[PDB]
Symmetry: C2
Subunit: 62 residues, 2 copies
């Protein structure tokens, strides 16, 4: 399928960043994963379009 | 040893909470773990004395 395949997640919990370049999100927000190595994934919000690093346990693939 | 044994952690990354009852902390802050089941652990900051739930990947046992 498309490039979104294995690369869409839903936030399980809200996240407020505390480090420049980290991305916040609301619970239930959908994000596109750009890079998924280590415990901080590069993502793009499908709500705001903004990009940055997210804590991987706060989201689930769907 | 003492009850602190297996129950002290150091924050690997800062955390800003976004849910009542969740506990924020600075990078390098030391916390006492009160409960360590699931991915949200009940903790007490050894900086502020405050208690609440923390995301377990943000800390490391020491
Ligand atoms: Ca998990
Ligand atoms: Ca970890
Ligand atoms: Zn960070
Ligand atoms: Zn919470």
């Amino acid at each position: 399928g498309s490039p979104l395949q294995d690369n869409l997640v839903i936030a399980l919990h809200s996240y407020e960043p505390s480090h420049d370049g980290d991305l916040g999100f609301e619970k239930g927000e959908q994000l596109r994963i750009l890079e998924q190595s280590g415990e901080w994934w590069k993502a793009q919000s499908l709500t705001t379009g903004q990009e940055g690093f997210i804590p991987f346990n706060f989201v689930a693939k769907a």
